[PDB]
Design a protein around this ligand. Sequence first.
Ligand SMILES: CCCCCCCCCCCCO[C@@H]1O[C@H](CO)[C@@H](O[C@H]2O[C@H](CO)[C@@H](O)[C@H](O)[C@H]2O)[C@H](O)[C@H]1O
Ligand SMILES: CCCCCCCCCCCCO[C@@H]1O[C@H](CO)[C@@H](O[C@H]2O[C@H](CO)[C@@H](O)[C@H](O)[C@H]2O)[C@H](O)[C@H]1O
Ligand SMILES: CCCCCCCCCCCCO[C@@H]1O[C@H](CO)[C@@H](O[C@H]2O[C@H](CO)[C@@H](O)[C@H](O)[C@H]2O)[C@H](O)[C@H]1O
Lengths: 88, 12, 171, 108, 104, 459, 170, 547, 14
Amino acid sequence: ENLYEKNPDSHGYDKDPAVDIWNMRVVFFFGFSIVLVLGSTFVAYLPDYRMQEWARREAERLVKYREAHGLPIMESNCFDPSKIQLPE
Amino acid sequence: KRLFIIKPSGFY
Amino acid sequence: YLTHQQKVLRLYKRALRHLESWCIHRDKYRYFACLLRARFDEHKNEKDMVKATQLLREAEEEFWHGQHPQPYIFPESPGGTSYERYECYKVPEWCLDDWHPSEKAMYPDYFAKREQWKKLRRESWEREVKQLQEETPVGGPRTEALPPARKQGDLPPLWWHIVTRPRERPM
Amino acid sequence: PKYEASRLSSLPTTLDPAEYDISSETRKAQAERLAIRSRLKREYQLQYYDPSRRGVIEDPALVRWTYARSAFGIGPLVFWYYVFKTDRDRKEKLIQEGKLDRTFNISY
Amino acid sequence: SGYTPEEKLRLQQLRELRRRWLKDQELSPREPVLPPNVIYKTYRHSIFAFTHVLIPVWIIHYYLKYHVTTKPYTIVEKKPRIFPGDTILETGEVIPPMKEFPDQ
Amino acid sequence: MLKYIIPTIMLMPLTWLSKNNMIWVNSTAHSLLISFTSLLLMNQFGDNSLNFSLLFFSDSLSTPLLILTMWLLPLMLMASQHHLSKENLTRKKLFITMLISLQLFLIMTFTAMELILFYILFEATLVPTLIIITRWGNQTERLNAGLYFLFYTLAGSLPLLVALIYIQNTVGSLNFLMLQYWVQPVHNSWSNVFMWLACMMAFMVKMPLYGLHLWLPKAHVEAPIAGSMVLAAVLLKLGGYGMLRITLILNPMTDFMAYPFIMLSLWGMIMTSSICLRQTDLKSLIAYSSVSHMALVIVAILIQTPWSYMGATALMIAHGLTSSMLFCLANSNYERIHSRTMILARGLQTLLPLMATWWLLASLTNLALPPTINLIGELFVVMSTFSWSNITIILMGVNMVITALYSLYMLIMTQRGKYTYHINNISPSFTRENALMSLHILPLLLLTLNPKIILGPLY
Amino acid sequence: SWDKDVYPEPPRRTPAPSPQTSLPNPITYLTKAFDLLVDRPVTLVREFIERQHAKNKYYYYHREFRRVPDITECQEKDVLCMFEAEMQWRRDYKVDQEIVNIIQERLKACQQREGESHRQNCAKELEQFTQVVKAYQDRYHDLGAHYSARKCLAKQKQRMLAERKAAKEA
Amino acid sequence: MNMFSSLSLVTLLLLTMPIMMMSFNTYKPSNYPLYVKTAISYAFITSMIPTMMFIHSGQELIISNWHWLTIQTLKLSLSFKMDYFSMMFIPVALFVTWSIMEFSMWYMYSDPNINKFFKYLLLFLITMLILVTANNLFQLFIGWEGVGIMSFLLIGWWYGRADANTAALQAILYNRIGDIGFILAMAWFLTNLNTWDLQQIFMLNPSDSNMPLIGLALAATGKSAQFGLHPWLPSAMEGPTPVSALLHSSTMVVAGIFLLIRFYPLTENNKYIQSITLCLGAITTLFTAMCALTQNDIKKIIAFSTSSQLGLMMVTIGINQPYLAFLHICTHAFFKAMLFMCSGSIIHSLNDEQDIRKMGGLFKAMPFTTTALIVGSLALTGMPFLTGFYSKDLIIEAANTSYTNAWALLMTLIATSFTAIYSTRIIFFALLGQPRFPTLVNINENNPLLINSIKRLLIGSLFAGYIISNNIPPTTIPQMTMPYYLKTTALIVTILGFILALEISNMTKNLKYHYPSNAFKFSTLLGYFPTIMHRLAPYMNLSMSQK
Amino acid sequence: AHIEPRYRQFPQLT
Ligand SMILES: CCCCCCCCCCCCO[C@@H]1O[C@H](CO)[C@@H](O[C@H]2O[C@H](CO)[C@@H](O)[C@H](O)[C@H]2O)[C@H](O)[C@H]1O
Ligand SMILES: CCCCCCCCCCCCO[C@@H]1O[C@H](CO)[C@@H](O[C@H]2O[C@H](CO)[C@@H](O)[C@H](O)[C@H]2O)[C@H](O)[C@H]1O
Ligand SMILES: CCCCCCCCCCCCO[C@@H]1O[C@H](CO)[C@@H](O[C@H]2O[C@H](CO)[C@@H](O)[C@H](O)[C@H]2O)[C@H](O)[C@H]1O
């Protein structure tokens, strides 16, 4: 069978032309106008996803502070050896 | 002479 | 499959075309084309078909040795540079059926003439099927040849896809 | 000069001796083959040219082919295991002896 | 070695139809039925320069001047070459000459 | 997660209470709204995950998988309705109800805190899946061929259940947040070897691992289009998602227990790509294509480095959208010619010009053309496995060559060359089909602009 | 715009134009054509926008994270204290990734800026990049995809044991 | 820097505008090809303003405008390196593309998909400018694979022809083998360094650079079709003639050479990689030149001419003269693109005949095509002071006086002589003699699109080398002191090639019966590399798959 | 066509 024989304007959704035109509109409005257009906008303006932009501001703060005080920009030890009690 | 060019339906 | 008479003529044609590929220049080619023709003429009136077959076999061995690595090929022949270049432009006629009515509204004279052909195809099909069945021996065809229309008003059986085949330069 | 056919280089039909020594049993087989091809051609053409047929001319020969088709081993695995296992053992040893250069390597 | 009498007749009958079919691919005079000097070259070029050069550079300059260059190290120049005898614009400094070359 | 569970359940009353001719309109519209609200899950943090309650949580791993799961329901409904149009009304609603219930189990599976809760749902997804594949499948052949059900349950589901039950006794909990702080190293021990295999074999079969993969091509050849979409896009990622989680508690035994599975994946990555060159069935070709791509994900998970986990997450999402689109493209041809043979209909670009553009885009993402997230994921796994061992670049590179070969071979065979003469029922592409393809590819390409939201928690 | 100390750049020295040809310099003329057709209309548009911005003045802040006890002070299997120390370690790990990024950006900016003299004139940038990369590698390299404060501490103590042992050997 | 950078990006942005307008923005499909040509022409003008500023004071920039992604300690940004190589290559490529697009406005006139053809050429150009301006390896990879796909889509333009689909897929196969080397470099640079940026790579300047540089040499081997991964470039003649003109000049094939030029700060200090690329180039330059001697298809000859000149470029890389390798890319694009446009002019007149044995007697029949072909041929063969002489002549002088592989040098000089032989072969068989083409004469080169497009490249093939070589700044110390017999070596072997080719061509006229030779069949059949490799390698792989 | 094709003859030039 061919949906185009009965309805040369068929969108391929339904045999009834009225339902076939409603089913197109919803797929196109909620699929492209809402999810893909507003979803892309929403994602494009996410408030600092996973804190990456805060980390850069914090790193600038620390680099500025550590260079103005002669401290190393970064130390090998992540934890203070004073609070570590080695075995043996 | 201008001839007809058989093509697939471009409307859809 | 072929006769002896056909194998020689196919080797004469193929020999000439490769000789033309070697010579390039028309005067040089015309000189050796008559030398080659003379070689065939030397054995035109042989009667011992055992000798005649051995002559052909040695000729084909000679051809394969003297064959040209890059013979000239007509651009549109199989293996040529234009072979099948326009296949991407050949659209079968049945695709016009699926056109939207607004697309068919642009060519009202063409599509009116196209229903005349489709009508002709319908009214002819039953007669074509009979003619093949009545003329066809028991056990099916022995060959691929097809007959002509026998009466006035009939169309030769199985003609649509030959007649309505895409033009060789569709676009 | 004699031609030597290979798997990827067939013997030319004009040099094949079988193509000149045809008897009447060979000619009868050639007719039997043209009859089959002709019967199949007619069967296809009566469907191909039918004005009212819209669809696909189902081909049993194509079905039989894809049916049969759709219906070394560990060795390379053992080989690759020793290639990688050996490499990563040599690399692991060098890192513990500080002999491997990773001066700027901080992505992994 | 030529056509058999039936082969010629079938060929002739298919010639009539094939030639008639090709004649029918010709378009009617009305078909397709469609639904409803320096200045010119300058205007076409002038309007092209405006839409495809001036507007793009307005957007690009705005983007670079106010959004890119205001972030560090986004546009990094190679420092200009200073040759002896130059005058530095920023400071007014004067680069000395080179030693006197030996004769050559 | 109740703001997604409850509306998903409400798709069942909606489907059964709609007018007879509105079932497709109603369910597609509302399932697209649920997909819209799923973007609120991207409220992720650099340090902590989004821990909703004692049962469910979301982090950067599950969040993209949840969004993909919720996106796929409307797409499956659009893809299914043409061939189910001759089905009677009560059976259309049951078919839709199976899809809704499958989404309900999937969103709960991806967010469960407790690994036993994950196990029950991870298995409950098979009940709707087998029903869809068998009840609406092509032939009388059994997808659960008996051998496969036995092998999987004996060597997969059951050992995983006992291992999880054993772990909770020893640790006192299977909550994943607790397992992050109370994890203890796994020492060498014949008993521990069996705990390792028990914790992993179930997910290896579902991925599938090379050598345990023969079930997947068989399932695709039998499934309806919706079945193939969910199976390729999500259900394989259940095994990948499970491994990414459970490997937390398997160290350092994974240091050596992973070698056979890396070897199977690295070699099977090339063997399955080569098989794709001699496939006569589109659905089989795409199925073997998935085995090749999922071989990278197994390798990435098993070498467990930050780059391989980022690459694994990107690969799972990119493959989900690409393999799903490839199955939809193949299905559209099938709905005209009624055959899965790839050689039957050729030169289709002549007859369906726009659909040939969808084919090209689907093939370019499949062969990992930069900068598509298909490549971003694949490149990251290649970068990480080079560190694991430089020799791997040879196998990774060769697979890249072969992948380009069968991707364009599939495009060339079906779209280019001369068209088949006797196939005269190729009707123009429907708006439904064109929209179905564009809803696969547009989000896939848009993610190239913001890849970070698909890179997982390691980002 | 940014902080000059964090992203330093040396003073710019551009030599004065010293033409020695009667031909007009087409670049200087194109510069005026640019400064008139492009810069000024662009500046007018921006100044109007910045006028609207000045009317509406609101502020955003850089989040400050008070310090909490590290993993070294947490009791074994005490998730409440391990949780806060674990989150703090992840925040520091993310910050350290961006400290290394700042130092790399200095190194790359230096190389381009110095042109053909970069090998000599970017030795300070290269040395700083070397030490920071070394310190970052010491902290976080080889932890695995399932890294944590606990595994970072185990790596450190192993390194501290090797340092302590080689002291005796000395 | 405000004007330099703004005009640097508008050139890239401008080329993409016809692509964006394809979404039916005032779309005028009446003359989309004209719209595309105009955008290229205006893109050429705007690109020449940054070039003048660089010529003036050597000004150069990096524009890292958009931060795309950060992977822990690897920040990825959209960064454009607008330096020496970008400054000079972009105007040349835009100038050449402008002529090829105007030529295509006539050559492809009857193609129903004319608009789609021009869109593909524009994308094919865009992905090349992404490649050249790229400042990090990832963005370089986007362009690197970008040209590869457009090569596939344009080589396989006539997609009903199985030979076209086979050549399109062959280009992809050989190029993705080279891309194994590209990812190997990316993997090595990320691991051993911590960057894909060229700046941090050069700043760290590793000495243990064998592995990343073997990866780049392999990547250049496939993309620029050096020996081993070379058969695809001749096969690429299946595409329309305008495609071959772009492919063989201002886009794909030079990307492999361009990549190695980018990394000259590394190849400088690696005598091992210099020795590999010298020998790799030397066999390529000779082997492909030898193949061109016996070819009869006019497009095949020019296609092998490219492989032979790309081989010479690879030699220049291997004698540590990267800036002469670049100068040859620029000059070669002029006369090589013209030769393809002259072949297409002949092919079109003779109704799609590409076999020189069916040409002849065209010297007067096509006067302007003849003039351009002779100028193009002389420029290719290093006639003094034409565009090709300013690069080829210095390259042979620099190769002669270097501490070099002796065998590579001899193979490079013989390939120079062969260049004069197959160039003569085209002139003799296409233009001289009596006509050998069919009897219905449709020779007509009177079209302004054809005349103007070829004329602009003809002017470039005369003065482009002189103008460029007088404006670029010195980056090396050219070695100008040397014996007479080394100074004049390039001219001498070129002249003996011309003399040695006249005798061979004239003997074709004697009424003597040839005799095939082992050397002749070896050259005609391309050394049998396609016949063996393209049958055996697919057989082993495809038969391996089923079982 | 401002240039007429010829048969077996040298083409018309401008
Ligand atoms: C926030 C939630 C948003 C959910 C949005 C869902 C949108 C779905 C829209 C589908 C609307 C279809 O609604 C149904 O369809 C038919 C056409 O077949 C329409 O038309 C029919 O009903 C109306 C009302 O009697 C009459 O014109 C007539 O009976 C008939 O034409 C009506 O609209 C309705 O009977
Ligand atoms: C793509 C379309 C998407 C549409 C939805 C998103 C758009 C929403 C835009 C609303 C933005 C409002 O942002 C808001 O601006 C006003 C400006 O006075 C600020 O208001 C506040 O700022 C300062 C002091 O704090 C004062 O000027 C003001 O009296 C005070 O109320 C808010 O602190 C800020 O949060
Ligand atoms: C990054 C942001 C960029 C912002 C760009 C904003 C858009 C500005 C462009 C508006 C006008 C575009 O106009 C678009 O291009 C040219 C303009 O002459 C038109 O093309 C026109 O000129 C060309 C030659 O010059 C002719 O071949 C063509 O027949 C004619 O129609 C296109 O048919 C039209 O679609």
